[PDB]
Amino acid sequence: LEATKEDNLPDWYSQVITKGEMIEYYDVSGCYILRHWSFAIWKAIRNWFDAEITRLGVKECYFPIFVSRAALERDFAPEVAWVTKSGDSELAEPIAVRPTSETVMYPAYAKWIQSYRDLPIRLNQWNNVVRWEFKHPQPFLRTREFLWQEGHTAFATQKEADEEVLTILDLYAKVYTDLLAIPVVKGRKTEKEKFAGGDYTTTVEAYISASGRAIQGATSHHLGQNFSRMFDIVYEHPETKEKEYVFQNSWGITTRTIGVMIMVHADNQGLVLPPRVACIQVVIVPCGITATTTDDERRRLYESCRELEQTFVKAGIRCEGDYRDNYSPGWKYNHWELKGVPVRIELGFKDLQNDQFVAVRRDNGAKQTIKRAQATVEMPKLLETIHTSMYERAERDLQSHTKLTKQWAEFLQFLETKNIIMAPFCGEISCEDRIKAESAMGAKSLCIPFEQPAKIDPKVDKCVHPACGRVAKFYTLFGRSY
Amino acid sequence: LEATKEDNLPDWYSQVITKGEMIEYYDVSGCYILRHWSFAIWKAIRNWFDAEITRLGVKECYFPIFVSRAALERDFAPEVAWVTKSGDSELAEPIAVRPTSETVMYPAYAKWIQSYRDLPIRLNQWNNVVRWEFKHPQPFLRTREFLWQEGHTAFATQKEADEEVLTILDLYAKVYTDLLAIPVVKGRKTEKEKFAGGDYTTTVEAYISASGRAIQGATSHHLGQNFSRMFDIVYEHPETKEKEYVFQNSWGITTRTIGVMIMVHADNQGLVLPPRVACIQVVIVPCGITATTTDDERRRLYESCRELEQTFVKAGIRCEGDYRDNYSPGWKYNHWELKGVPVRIELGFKDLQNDQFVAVRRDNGAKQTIKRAQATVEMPKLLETIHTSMYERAERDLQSHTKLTKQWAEFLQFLETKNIIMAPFCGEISCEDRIKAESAPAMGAKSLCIPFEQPAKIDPKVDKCVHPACGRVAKFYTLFGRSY
Ligand SMILES: Nc1ncnc2c1ncn2[C@@H]1O[C@H](COP(=O)(O)OP(=O)(O)NP(=O)(O)O)[C@@H](O)[C@H]1O
Ligand SMILES: Nc1ncnc2c1ncn2[C@@H]1O[C@H](COP(=O)(O)OP(=O)(O)NP(=O)(O)O)[C@@H](O)[C@H]1O
Ligand SMILES: O=C(C[C@H]1NCCC[C@@H]1O)Cn1cnc2cc(Br)c(Cl)cc2c1=O
Ligand SMILES: O=C(C[C@H]1NCCC[C@@H]1O)Cn1cnc2cc(Br)c(Cl)cc2c1=O
Ligand SMILES: [Mg+2]
Ligand SMILES: [Mg+2]
Ligand SMILES: [Zn+2]
Ligand SMILES: [Zn+2]
């Protein structure tokens, strides 16, 4: 590993994603070959979330990657990738590679709702979407093609919609903290940062101390009746028949997760995978095989290592051994340290003589010896222990970069000191622009958190800036972002 | 269903796939909205095959949907979709939507095999691909975007490659016979119909009698060293430091599976889904209505039906009840019969009094009464019974359309009356072209495959090719017929 995380972050990240065997750079700018290592992490995330939402009643479909011009046109216009040509023959009308599927799914929804009896609609797509991002692309954070799931739901009454938005958001937050061991702040986005066609938007924000910047981890919007008016998704009331518009929601999460994991956990020696998503959770690395190693002893070692690995598998542990005779044990140590496998097993001849083995943690590198009887009990403890110690390590990190203040001056102080700031705010868009302006790379709104620091005292509290709406409507989290 | 399968096949196919709620037609020609129902079918096939191939050891990755012009340019040119514009701004280089990934994965392979020690590389991706086909598209058989799985593999020795080719081909055929209940002919593709960049091509062909045509259900190719040579996928031989090229396969299967399912099994009342991929295997339909609704009895009926479906799901059976108030039991009957649910459950107040229910089969409409204790046993047996009755009927159909001959004249007779033929063949492509011509959306006859189960030795003492003008090698038997 060539670069360090603290000095020269972009090339630390590059080094990690390549020497960790998750990326291969690709000759269409801003898209990246996904290797087995990364893709398994995405599979773990995808599988948990789909089990969750299929338990809830969301069904799965798939709309085509292509969107007609006419479909799309009824403004992110500069972000649309256009097929214009089939080979050498130029196309009558161009077709667009999808960025999202509202334009295609909501007309379908108008067609599928023939009566009140057809509601609710709860569909989800696991697909890939292409946005010709103008902002600097980063290998997992912002790729021009990315894989995600997008769910679009239609409801009779607004209660169902509000409840599902929050349900999905709790799911998203659990993906972050329970799968990837990352702390996140749940909140509402301001009127400036909400999804334009929506009503309100929930988010799950995370903070990179390295970058000093925060990043949106997923979104769950409540669309209200905005789109159902746009696309005329209506039904007649069963009693007192009158044209009623349905209530909608949409939500999404992407491979950005992997990037956020990297940024939060990887150290200066490679990746550090959260145990619950790591492809290989335990790797056994046989050692002690000197020059004078009688081939019977090398076979005996290999036999015991394979027996240990499979008794791990039977106890539900993703464990593999590394028995390649072309590499030294120390080489194997480094290799798997870059791949960030949570626990390495060291099984030498002396450990064999004692019916034990030594486990080494990828975070903090602590060694600890374990007898082979307790293998199926200690090892899962250790995996959970690692998860917690990762999450807490990051959570304390977040808590040390969040400062609360009611003054602009020390707001700017904090912002320059590489941390994000909780301050009272009016919410007004003009003022939010003024804050970002006078902070320059300037300070953006992250979300209005669900957990407020204090109740706002209306006779006292004021906004964090000079003109505003004056009266503080709530506390908002602000900071530099991705 | 307005139209019949027998008269007006295309319009029947449209009616079943729409009123069965799997397709939604789409305003970009040759793409089709996959509704929840069909996609559940695809999901089952995918999970089965993925369990299988990752158990064998194939790993999964994901390359971008976009291909550099240069990558791709290093025949099918009119089928490539080109992104040229990002909104307003035209792009530096144009990019192509992937049509397959050899052009892109094999350079990575060349970068990834640094030694003999890195071998074998056995990768799979589940992804979507686009081809602007020059043929009329039909909703699952040939779509302009379609989803698939492509597996690409590289091996030190040719033996490993041959073996995986055949293993994978067996897995494809199992998807067809164990999952979709369709009988399929394993074979080798002729020199004319094999994949051009390959060595040989295996296939699994299936026959739809409605259209009287065969269709390729999947492919497993042996690329040998042709692609390893193009892209210089090499390693240094261990004993002798000398450049050795790897041996490769690639194989793939697409959403066409669902189409052949539809074509082979659905009747003139809608779908008939095979039990092992059916999204709902059993639908429960109560039977008390109108004025006779002492609501206590309606709640008693609903609560016992939820108990039966719950005890069915816990025994791993995909069962849901249909309890909507709006509709009548006869409507729900017709609805789910369009959806091809293998067995419909009818549970009225009388069966309630007798601790029973009656199950009706979607394939025959045959009824059979079942007491509620034995439900946990009788239902899965019925699911197996229904499966094999589907496969067996389809196999009797295939066998009654497979005919064998050595005289060209009766080859043409058999083909003209809508069935497929197995005849002695030389293997030559010019001769195959003459065959296809002399039979005349291809109205001529194609080579389907050289079957693995040959009937009779094609012994050269006297055996000659079935065409009058061929160089009568009589190398083997080939299966011919109109195909998709
Ligand atoms: N290019 C991308 N690569 C990966 N994940 C992305 C990308 N763009 C957006 N996401 C994530 O996808 C979720 C839903 O997308 P969306 O809300 O449409 O993002 P967005 O408005 O474009 N955010 P931004 O990148 O700041 O413009 C967000 O919560 C992001 O975390
Ligand atoms: N447009 C399509 N839609 C769905 N399945 C397809 C399509 N084209 C090919 N297939 C299937 O996908 C598998 C792999 O594709 P491929 O090897 O390219 O077939 P192919 O050479 O294109 N045959 P052809 O349909 O005549 O062009 C084959 O087994 C086909 O049955
Ligand atoms: O895509 C969204 C909002 C939501 N869509 C459903 C899944 C979750 C997601 O947050 C916002 N957005 C973002 N980027 C876009 C890029 C283009 Br190009 C287009 Cl046309 C449209 C959009 C667009 O609407
Ligand atoms: O796609 C293939 C061969 C194999 N690729 C890997 C998955 C299994 C599959 O049988 C054949 N084929 C078919 N159609 C194509 C269309 C275009 Br456009 C291109 Cl460039 C290339 C191709 C092309 O190579
Ligand atoms: Mg964006
Ligand atoms: Mg083709
Ligand atoms: Zn203000
Ligand atoms: Zn011949």
Q: Which residues of B409-424 are buried (b: 16+ CB within 10 A; e: fewer)?
A: eebeebbeeebbbbbb
Spatial separation of the C-alpha atoms in residues A256 and A138, rounded to whole Å? 10
Phi, psi of B307 (to 5 degrees): -65, -45
Least Cα distance to B67 among B92, B106, B98 occurs for B98
Q: Which value, in Å, is the radius of gyration of the alpha carbons in chain A? A: 26
Choose the residue to mutate in B49, B58, B63, B100 for probing ligand 4, maximizing ligand atoms within 8 Å of C-beta. B100
Least Cα distance to A103 among A84, A75, A122, A134 occurs for A75
Cis omega (within 30 of 0) on the bond before B120? Answer: yes
> Which residues 98-117 on chain B approach chain A with CB closer than 8 angstroms?
108, 111, 115, 117
B193 lines ligand 4 (CB under 6 A): no
Task: Tell which of B19, B23, B28, B47 to mutate to test the A interface (max A CBs under 10 Å).
Answer: B28
> Which residues 36-55 on chain A approach chain B with CB closer than 8 angstroms?
36, 39-40, 43
Find the ligand nearest to A433 CA: 7
Strand partners, B368: B359
Q: Is B195 exposed, middle or buried (0-12, 13-18, 19+ CB in 10 A)?
A: middle
Q: Is B196 exposed, middle or buried (0-12, 13-18, 19+ CB in 10 A)?
A: exposed
> Long-range contact list for A22-28, CB < 8 A, 24+ apart?
A22/A258, A22/A271, A23/A139, A24/B108, A24/B111, A26/B63, A26/B64, A27/B68, A27/B70, A27/B71, A28/A144, A28/B64, A28/B66, A28/B67, A28/B68, A28/B95
Q: Which residues 6+ apart lie within 8 Å of A124 measured at CB? A: A50, A53, A58, A59, A60, A61, A149, A150, A151, A152
List the end-to-end C-alpha distance of chain B, in Å, as a whole number.
Answer: 25
Closest residue CA from atom 26 of ligand 1: A482
Helix (H) or strand (E) holding B388, with range, is helix B375-401
A307 labeled binding residue: no
Q: How far lies B419's CA from each of B369, B414, B416, B422, B482, in Å?
A: 40, 6, 8, 10, 8
* DSSP string covering B299-312: HHHHHHHHHHHHHH
Residues at Cβ < 5 Å from ligand 7 ion: A 426, 431, 463, 465, 468
B329 CA to centre of ligand 5 in angstroms: 49
Spatial separation of the C-alpha atoms in residues B154 and B108, rounded to whole Å? 12
Q: Nearest C-alpha of chain B: how many angstroms from A139?
A: 12
A82 touches chain B (CB under 8 A): yes
Which is the closest atom of ligand 2 to the Cα of B252?
A: 14
B426 labeled binding residue: yes
Is B36 strand, coil or helix? helix
Find the ligand nearest to B446 CA: 2
- The secondary structure of chain A, three-state, reads CCCCCCCCHHHHHHHHHHHCCCEEECCCCCCEEECHHHHHHHHHHHHHHHHHHHHHCCEECECCCEEEHHHHCCCCHHHCEEEEEECCEEEEEEEEECCCCHHHHHHHHHHHCCCHHHCCEEEEEEEEEECCCCCCCECCCECCEEEEEEEEEEECCHHHHHHHHHHHHHHHHHHHHHHCCCCCEEEECCCCCCCCCCCEEEEEEEEECCCCEEEEEEEEEEEECHHHHHCCCEEECCCCCCEEECEEEEEEEECHHHHHHHHHHCECCECCCCCCCCCCCEEEEECCCCCCCCHHHHHHHHHHHHHHHHHHHHCCCCEEECCCCCCCHHHHHHHHHHCCCCEEEEECHHHHHCCEEEEEECCCCCEEEEECCCHHHHHHHHHHHHHHHHHHHHHHHHHHHEEECCCHHHHHHHHHCCCEEEEEECCCHHHHHHHHHHHCCCCEEEEEECCCCCCCCCCCCECCCCCCCCECCEEEEEECEC
**Nearest Cα residue in chain B from A70:** B27
In degrees, rounded to 5, the angle at the alpha carbon of residue B280 between the alpha carbons of residues B265 and A61 is 90
B17 CA to centre of ligand 5 in angstroms: 36
Q: Name the one residue in this structure whose structure tokens are 């403004």.
A: A75
Task: Tell which of A65, A79, A126, A236 to mutate to test the B interface (max B CBs under 10 Å).
Answer: A65
Spatial separation of the C-alpha atoms in residues A138 and A258, rounded to whole Å? 12
Contact list, B74 vs chain A (CB under 8 Å): none
In degrees, rounded to 5, the angle at the alpha carbon of residue B208 between the alpha carbons of residues B202 and B209 is 135
Strand partners, A358: A346, A369
In degrees, rounded to 5, the angle at the alpha carbon of residue B96 between the alpha carbons of residues B91 and B97 is 125
Phi, psi of A82 (to 5 degrees): -115, 120
Q: What is the resolution of this structure in A?
A: 2.9
Spatial separation of the C-alpha atoms in residues B13 and A250, rounded to whole Å? 33
Amino acid identity for residue A449 in this structure: P
Q: Name the one residue in this structure whose structure tokens are 């990828």.
A: A362
Spatial separation of the C-alpha atoms in residues A437 and A430, rounded to whole Å? 11
DSSP class of residue B117 equals G
Find the ligand nearest to A215 CA: 1
Spatial separation of the C-alpha atoms in residues B230 and B24, rounded to whole Å? 42
Which region holds residue B19: left if phi is over 0, alpha if psi is between -120 and 50, else beta? alpha
Is B19 strand, coil or helix? helix
Whether B481 and B207 have beta carbons less than 8 Å apart is answered as: yes
A133 labeled binding residue: yes
A65 touches chain B (CB under 8 A): yes
Contact list, B71 vs chain A (CB under 8 Å): 27
Strand partners, A66: A97
Contact B86 A79 (CB under 8 A): yes
Q: Which residues 6+ apart lie within 8 Å of B208 measured at CB? A: B214, B215, B260, B263, B264
B11 lines ligand 4 (CB under 6 A): no
Spatial separation of the C-alpha atoms in residues A482 and A475, rounded to whole Å? 21
Determination technique for this entry: X-ray
Amino acid identity for residue A136 in this structure: H
Whether B149 and B125 have beta carbons less than 8 Å apart is answered as: yes
Q: Is A210 exposed, middle or buried (0-12, 13-18, 19+ CB in 10 A)?
A: middle
Q: Name the one residue in this structure whose structure tokens are 């990240």.
A: A13
Q: Which residues of B346-366 are buried (b: 16+ CB within 10 A; e: fewer)?
A: bbbeebbeeebbbbbbbbeee
Q: Which two tokens stand for residue B400?
A: 């009654």
Q: Which two tokens stand for residue B206?
A: 């299936």
A196 touches chain B (CB under 8 A): no
Helix, strand, coil in percent for chain B, rounding step 5: 35, 30, 35
Least Cα distance to A225 among A247, A195, A208, A192 occurs for A247
Spatial separation of the C-alpha atoms in residues B203 and B188, rounded to whole Å? 6
Phi, psi of A24 (to 5 degrees): -130, 130
Whether B221 and B227 have beta carbons less than 8 Å apart is answered as: no
Spatial separation of the C-alpha atoms in residues A344 and A348, rounded to whole Å? 13
Which is the closest atom of ligand 2 to the Cα of B218?
A: 29
B207 CA to centre of ligand 8 in angstroms: 24
Spatial separation of the C-alpha atoms in residues A206 and A394, rounded to whole Å? 10
Among the partner residues A59, A60, A65, nearest to B128 by beta-carbon distance: A65
Q: How far lies B367's CA from each of B319, B358, B360, B364, B370, in Å?
A: 18, 7, 4, 9, 10
Spatial separation of the C-alpha atoms in residues A165 and A247, rounded to whole Å? 12
Least Cα distance to B182 among B250, B276, B103 occurs for B276
DSSP class of residue B45 equals H
Least Cα distance to A136 among A267, A29, A222, A242 occurs for A29
Is B414 strand, coil or helix? helix
Amino acid identity for residue B464 in this structure: K
B80 lines ligand 4 (CB under 6 A): yes
B147 CA to centre of ligand 2 in angstroms: 11
B201 lines ligand 2 (CB under 6 A): no
Helix (H) or strand (E) holding B111, with range, is helix B102-112
Spatial separation of the C-alpha atoms in residues B30 and B143, rounded to whole Å? 5
Beta strands in B30-189 (DSSP E): 32-34, 59-60, 66-68, 81-86, 89-97, 121-130, 145-155, 185-188
Number of Cβ within 10 Å of residue A285's Cβ equals 24
Whether B341 and B363 have beta carbons less than 8 Å apart is answered as: no
A79 CA to centre of ligand 5 in angstroms: 8
Q: How far lies A386's CA from each of A265, A363, B127, in Å?
A: 12, 7, 34
* Pairing status of strand A282-286 against strand A319-321: parallel
Q: Which two tokens stand for residue A291?
A: 């020059």
A427 CA to centre of ligand 7 in angstroms: 6
Least Cα distance to B249 among B150, B145, B396, B148 occurs for B150
Q: Nearest C-alpha of chain B: how many angstroms from A446?
A: 29
* Pairing status of strand A343-347 against strand A319-321: unpaired
B24 touches chain A (CB under 8 A): yes
Cis omega (within 30 of 0) on the bond before A449? Answer: no
Whether A97 and A65 have beta carbons less than 8 Å apart is answered as: yes
* DSSP string covering B169-216: HHHHHHIIIIIS----EEEEPPTTTS-TTSSEEEEEEEEETTTTEEEE
Contact A117 B62 (CB under 8 A): no
* Pairing status of strand A121-130 against strand A81-86: unpaired
Contact A117 B65 (CB under 8 A): no
Closest residue CA from atom 10 of ligand 1: A254
Is B235 strand, coil or helix? strand
Q: Nearest C-alpha of chain A: how many angstroms from B201?
A: 27
> Which residues 313-352 on chain A approach chain B with CB closer than 8 angstroms?
324, 326
Least Cα distance to B38 among B345, B241, B308, B266 occurs for B266
Spatial separation of the C-alpha atoms in residues A331 and B23, rounded to whole Å? 54
Whether B184 and B205 have beta carbons less than 8 Å apart is answered as: yes
Q: Which residues 6+ apart lie within 8 Å of B313 measured at CB? A: B319
Q: Which two tokens stand for residue B34?
A: 């996959």
| Domains identified in chain B and CATH numbers | 9-265 (3.30.930.10), 282-385 (3.40.50.800), 401-481 (3.30.110.30)
Number of Cβ within 10 Å of residue B431's Cβ equals 20
C-alpha of B289 from chain center = 42
Q: How far lies A52's CA from each of A25, A278, B63, B302, in Å?
A: 33, 20, 27, 27
Helix (H) or strand (E) holding B438, with range, is helix B429-439
Number of residues assigned to chain A: 482
Whether A134 and A240 have beta carbons less than 8 Å apart is answered as: no
Whether B355 and B308 have beta carbons less than 8 Å apart is answered as: no
B89 CA to centre of ligand 5 in angstroms: 17
Contact A87 B82 (CB under 8 A): yes
List the end-to-end C-alpha distance of chain A, in Å, as a whole number.
Answer: 25
Choose the residue to mutate in A72, A98, A100 for probing ligand 3, maximizing ligand atoms within 8 Å of C-beta. A100
A428 labeled binding residue: no
A87 touches chain B (CB under 8 A): yes
* DSSP string covering B242-295: -EEE-EEEEEEEETHHHHHHHHHH-BTTB----TTT-SSSEEEEE---TT---H
Is B350 strand, coil or helix? helix
List residues in chain B that are followed by a break over 2.5 Å (C to N). 74, 440
Spatial separation of the C-alpha atoms in residues A6 and A13, rounded to whole Å? 11
B306 touches chain A (CB under 8 A): no
Contact B61 A87 (CB under 8 A): no
Whether A129 and A146 have beta carbons less than 8 Å apart is answered as: yes
Spatial separation of the C-alpha atoms in residues B232 and B256, rounded to whole Å? 33
Choose the residue to mutate in B128, B142, B175, B249 for probing ligand 2, maximizing ligand atoms within 8 Å of C-beta. B142
Least Cα distance to B484 among B21, B235, B142 occurs for B142
Q: Which two tokens stand for residue B199?
A: 């060595």
Spatial separation of the C-alpha atoms in residues A268 and A131, rounded to whole Å? 32
Whether B449 and B422 have beta carbons less than 8 Å apart is answered as: no
Task: Tell which of B38, B62, B84, B130 to mutate to test the A interface (max A CBs under 10 Å).
Answer: B62
Handedness of CA B435, B439, B440, B442 (dihedral sign): negative
Is B91 strand, coil or helix? strand
Q: Which residues 6+ apart lie within 8 Å of A428 measured at CB? A: A191, A468, A469
B465 labeled binding residue: yes
Contact list, A115 vs chain B (CB under 8 Å): 326
**Nearest Cα residue in chain B from A80:** B87
Q: Which two tokens stand for residue A395?
A: 């959570």
